[PDB]
Structure 1
Amino acid sequence: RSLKKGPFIDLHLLKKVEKAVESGDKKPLRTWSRRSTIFPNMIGLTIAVHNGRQHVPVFVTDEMVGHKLGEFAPTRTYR
């Protein structure tokens, strides 16, 4: 898609991810960052991605390699 030759991911979250990868899934992790672009290693693991007032529960699945954390999170309430 876009953003040139390879995306960015968050360092502090990556060390928590290696616990989630090695030990397997446990619970939604409460993360302030939305910034990371998902790649295969985050798949099958419960995380939670901030919307500016709460971490939104994303369980990661197969095609999410195409996506960032942030995309599933709603920052503007509606009727």
Structure 2
Amino acid sequence: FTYRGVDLDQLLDMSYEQLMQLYSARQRRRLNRGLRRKQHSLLKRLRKAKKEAPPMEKPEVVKTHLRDMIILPEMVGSMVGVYNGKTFNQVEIKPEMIGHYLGEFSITYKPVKHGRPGIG
């Protein structure tokens, strides 16, 4: 896999400053704004949960509310429950989603599949 001409080992070995030219307009915008302490702590729980896993095993899923989290490429390979109001949807963070938010992966409502009109 390659993103913007940069590889996965190349991205994961790249510093936090040099990421901030490789993203979208909103994403470079928010990384200019600087992340919050809640998201720092969530990434810290992700560090603890991705490290202590057995080496064959995928890490333990961490559930979270923060739908407005930028999917950093350091999160790739984890499993995260995303809260959409009712239900933590458990997404395996694959490397194809490094330029998106978590909030699009737990689709919030149920699709309208129509019935029939009664008394209109």
TM-score scaled to structure 2, two decimals?
0.57
Matched with 2:62 is 29
Q: Which runs of 5+ in 2 are unaligned?
A: 1-23, 114-120
Partners in 2 of 1:16 and 1:42 — Cα distance? 11
Partners in 2 of 1:43 and 1:15 — Cα distance? 14
Q: Tell me how large the CA RMSD over aligned residues is.
A: 1.9
Q: Bigger radius of gyration, 1 or 2?
A: 2
Matched with 1:54 is 87
**8 Å CA contact retained: 2:50, 2:59:** no
Q: Which runs of 5+ in 1 are unaligned?
A: none
* Relative contact order, higher structure (CA 8 A, sep 6+): 1
Per the alignment, in what secondary structure is the counterpart of residue 58 of structure 1? strand
TM-score scaled to structure 1, two decimals?
0.81
**Identity across the alignment (%):** 30
| Cα displacement (A) at 1:6 | 4.5
The count of residues paired between Structure 1 and Structure 2 equals 79
| Cα displacement (A) at 1:31 | 0.7
User: Which structure carries more helix by proportion?
Assistant: 2
Counterpart AA for 2:83:
H
